[PDB]
């Protein structure tokens, strides 16, 4: 596992190229918020160099670069800020779980945002990478639309105590906002599970089972992405680096408690999904029971009747077919007899 | 010494003796001609095509001073890829692969590489391999292999094997895409068998590729002085390539698994459909056959004379009960 950190060579690729491992390439933008106790300034731009002199800023600053399909801007920012090339690859790489790394001059945290669309019942994941330096917080996103609006409002309108603190409190605020978004996503999953379970009992079709299976896969991915988040917060408040002050640790502990709660909720979800899954099978087996019950009712009533009809329909030229009351109608009576009793017998089992 | 495999059709020996000044290549079917080449200070590449000929591989084994245990390992075809470090020679077991998009089968041919001072020994099973680019590079002096020792030759052979693995991955990706398209819409009985075969192939590929990654990792991370330091980074790069393969296989497996999942979702619905069909068909014919038999006895007193033209009336009542049953099956979503 552990070894000298280095760039990873890839086949069919130039030795030094960094590739964006994602799908979103629509737009790119850089929003910078440089705030202090007295005054703040925010601006949205596209030219990278216009935000480069913010590296050596006494007041804390927050640089949100939305759109990392532009590998040039990411490479320029990482090269000027002194970020390691492997960290740049991790920023551009998206098919990886949330993680935390500690370096001499910065801490690097990979986290996953989440959105859920009830239509198409889709759960989309977007990776956000945070880099905390001595006096600046870089945040690489993928596409327009984040869950850090409350933090932006707090910076703009001087709510909370975020203005009176350094960049560590800003990092805590961003992580807490992401955890709150996770809680909202869990509420949406509550709603989806309730809506699916109120239907799986009385509408047991194949598309319902496909929905249940994709929901199970969604919760599996949720567990696989939230457990590393719990580990990240644990290492963040139990192995604090010099960059993070001694103060603000209890806030990270609070975020850790929140992710413990989230993990517990996901654990309950993992069993509720199976609870829904069993119900469809039970209902289909019940319908199968009903149809095969009427089938066996018909078979039981009619097979002996056909048998005895064949017995009295076979010719031997010596057959007692002439009896009291000419013999024949009694057979029909017997038919009805060996019919009605069967029905009565089935009334013992309450079939049909 | 027993050959566990099944390929024994042909056997031949190939020799590539290359240096900076010049190279000599010869294909010989006799064991003796290749013995003296251990003494040559130039890099040497021997290739034993057939191991079913236990005599030649045994003679090479006791002539090169390699323990009979690695001989048994070479003849053990059903062996995982692995690496063994010894004082005068390093032993490596790898698996090639061949995929044909007509039978959807994945056959593995084990290959053994023994690296001794300034020479490399290959042990294969069949005519034809994936080290042709290395042969062309040696012959036409395209690369820097001619200016290095046998360790770079081993690196080149392993790299060629990894490239063949990449080609196999491309073929499997095409198969996975086609099968996914055929399964998500328009399923049939052939598709599930194809999915099972693909899952078996992916399981085998994964089960082979992880030991290969372990082999490369242990090979570059800490190695005896058999391979020079100059070739240490190159092996490292190959390891990275293997990682790609491994990860891809994992991803592929997931996709295939998902497919099987959906096919296992609708089995009970299929049961319900089948006996809906069977119950409908048996419902409307068992009583009809019963009453046909009722009118089919041989009783003399049977009221069978005229009575509104005789037979047709019963047909009528048949249809009556029939349509009644049809009505009873028009509702309840059976039909």
């Amino acid at each position: 596992h552990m070894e000298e950190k280095r760039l990873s060579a890839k086949k069919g690729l130039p030795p030094g190229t960094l590739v964006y491992t994602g799908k979103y390439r629509e737009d790119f933008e850089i929003e910078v918020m440089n705030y202090s106790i007295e005054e703040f300034r925010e601006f949205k731009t596209t030219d990278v160099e216009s935000v480069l002199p913010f590296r050596d800023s006494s007041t804390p600053t927050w640089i949100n670069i939305t759109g990392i399909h532009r590998t040039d801007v990411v490479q320029r920012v990482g090269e000027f800020f002194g970020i390691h090339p492997l960290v740049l690859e991790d920023i551009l790489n998206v098919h990886q779980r949330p993680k935390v790394e500690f370096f001499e001059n910065y801490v690097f945290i990979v986290l996953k945002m989440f959105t859920y669309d009830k239509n198409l019942h889709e759960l989309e994941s977007e990776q956000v990478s945070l880099i905390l330096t001595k006096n600046c917080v870089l945040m690489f996103q993928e596409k327009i639309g984040d869950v850090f609006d409350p933090v932006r409002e707090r910076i703009r309108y001087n709510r909370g105590i975020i203005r009176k603190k350094r960049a560590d409190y800003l990092l805590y605020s961003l992580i807490d906002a992401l955890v709150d978004d996770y809680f909202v996503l869990l509420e949406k999953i509550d709603d989806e599970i309730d809506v699916l379970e109120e239907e799986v009992l009385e509408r047991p079709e194949k598309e319902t089972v496909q929905r249940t299976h994709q929901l199970k896969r969604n919760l599996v991915e949720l567990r696989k992405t939230i457990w590393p988040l719990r580990e990240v917060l644990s290492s963040l408040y139990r192995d604090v680096p010099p960059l993070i002050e001694k103060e603000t640790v209890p806030y990270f502990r609070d975020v850790y408690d929140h992710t413990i709660q989230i993990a517990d909720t996901v654990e309950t979800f993992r069993d509720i999904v199976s609870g829904l899954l069993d119900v469809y099978l039970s209902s289909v087996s019940n319908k199968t029971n009903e149809v095969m019950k009427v089938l066996t009712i018909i078979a039981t009533i009619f097979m002996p009747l056909t048998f005895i009809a064949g017995i009295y329909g076979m010719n031997f030229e010596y057959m007692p077919e002439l009896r009291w009351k000419w013999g024949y109608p009694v057979v029909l009576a017997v038919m009805g007899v060996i019919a009605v009793i069967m029905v009565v017998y089935f009334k013992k089992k309450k079939w049909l | 010494l027993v050959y566990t495999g099944k390929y024994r059709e042909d056997f031949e020996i190939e020799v590539m003796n290359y240096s900076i000044e010049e190279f000599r290549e010869f294909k010989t079917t006799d064991v003796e001609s290749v013995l003296p080449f251990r003494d040559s200070s130039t890099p040497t590449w021997i290739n034993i095509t057939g191991i079913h000929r236990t005599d030649v591989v045994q003679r090479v084994g006791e002539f090169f001073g390699i323990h009979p245990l690695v001989l048994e390992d070479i003849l053990n075809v059903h062996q995982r890829p692995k690496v063994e470090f010894f004082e005068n020679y390093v032993f490596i077991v790898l698996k090639m692969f061949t995929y044909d998009k007509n039978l959807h089968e994945l056959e593995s041919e084990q290959v053994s590489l023994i690296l001794t001072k300034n020479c490399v020994l290959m042990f294969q099973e069949k005519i034809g391999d994936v080290f042709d680019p290395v042969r062309e590079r040696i012959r036409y002096n395209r690369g820097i292999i001619r200016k290095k020792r046998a360790d770079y030759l081993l690196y080149s052979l392993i790299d060629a094997l990894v490239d063949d693995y990449f080609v196999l991955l491309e073929k499997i990706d095409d198969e996975i895409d086609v099968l996914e398209e055929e399964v998500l819409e328009r399923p049939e009985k052939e598709t599930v068998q194809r999915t099972h075969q693909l899952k078996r192939n992916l399981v085998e590929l994964r089960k082979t590729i992880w030991p290969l990654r372990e082999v490369l990792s242990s090979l570059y991370r800490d190695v005896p002085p058999l391979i020079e330091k100059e070739t240490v980074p190159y092996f490292r790069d190959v390891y990275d390539h293997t990682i790609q393969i491994a990860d891809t296989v994992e991803t592929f497996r997931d996709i295939v698994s998902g497919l099987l999942d959906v096919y296992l979702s609708s089995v009970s619905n299929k049961t319900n459909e089948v006996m809906k069909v069977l119950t409908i068909i048996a419902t409307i014919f068992m009583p009809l056959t019963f009453i046909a038999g009722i009118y089919g006895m041989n009783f003399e007193y049977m009221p069978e004379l005229r009575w509104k033209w005789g037979y047709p009336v019963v047909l009528a009542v048949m249809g009556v009960i029939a349509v009644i049953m049809v009505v009873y099956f028009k509702k309840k979503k059976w039909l």
Partner: antibody
Amino acid sequence: ISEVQLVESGGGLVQPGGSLRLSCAASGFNVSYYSIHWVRQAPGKGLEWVASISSSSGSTSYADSVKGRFTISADTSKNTAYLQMNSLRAEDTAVYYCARSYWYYIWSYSYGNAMDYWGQGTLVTVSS
Amino acid sequence: DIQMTQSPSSLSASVGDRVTITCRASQSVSSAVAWYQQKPGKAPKLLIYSASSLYSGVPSRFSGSRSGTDFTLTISSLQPEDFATYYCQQSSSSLITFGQGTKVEIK
């Protein structure tokens, strides 16, 4: 600052067996962070990729039709790409385009490059 | 080399119709196929990459599909500004090759 723009120059009439250097000036981006391709299109025929350069490492790729003859290079100091064409045949008369490509990811083992922005293209005529 | 055989070559259709152009790779390419359009006398313009993804800025009417080694570009509804030559490109290997083109003309 400024939009992406690729400008070709250096094309012109040249005798068979001669040599000329096509220069592709890039404005709006750094050539070191992307790959630059040269694509050939004969008069009244389809496109034909002729060369590719990765300035961050100097790795080159050539088509089989021009292997050993064309030489592609790039300099970051001038932020420019160059295609030197010698031993030039009469079949090479065509319009040349200088395009910029970016890599995208499909699977962990497979990558692909797509040409975002193309240049105007310069016409090179080999005759007489 | 990898040969991309692209058919048809002289497709003709009217405005508002549905157009499908197919192209087949000689050997396996792992979905690394792009689709470009070129009007006469101008540089090609990228439309589709990864054989399914839609490039930024192009109209949504263009669509791309892949089945094994068969790549199809579909225009759901033609426009007066959609009559140009269309080219496949495979980028699986470092030697990247184009198709022969498919001209789309009014009928």
